[PDB]
Amino acid sequence: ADKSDLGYTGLTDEQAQELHSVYMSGLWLFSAVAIVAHLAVYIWRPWF
């Protein structure tokens, strides 16, 4: 016995993602690009 609005059950996974997916999405975004800001910045110095 539970909600999952015996239909909301599915769309949930999507809404439930509206807060989750998105979360783990921007999460690994500013956590990778940043890493670039650390390298990409000290990476455009050397060229040879």
Q: What is the CATH number of the domain that holds 8?
A: 1.20.5.250
Task: Determine if residue 13 is left, alpha or beta; phi over 0 gives left, psi from -120 to 50 gives alpha, anything else beta.
Answer: alpha
HSE-up (13 A, CA, CB side) for residue 23: 7
The structure's method of determination equals NMR
| Torsion angles phi and psi, residue 47, rounded to 5 | -150, -50
- Residue corresponding to tokens 């439930």: 16
Q: Please tell me the total count of domains within the chain.
A: 1
Q: How far apart are CA 22 and CA 20, in angstroms?
A: 5
* 3-35 per-residue burial string, b: 16 or more CB within 10 A, e: under 16: eeeeeeeeeeeeeeeeeeeeeeeeeeeeeeeee
Structural domain boundaries, residue 36: 1-48
Measuring CA to CA, which residue among 25, 14, 4, 12 is closest to residue 33? Answer: 25
Residue 20 counted as an annotated binding residue: yes
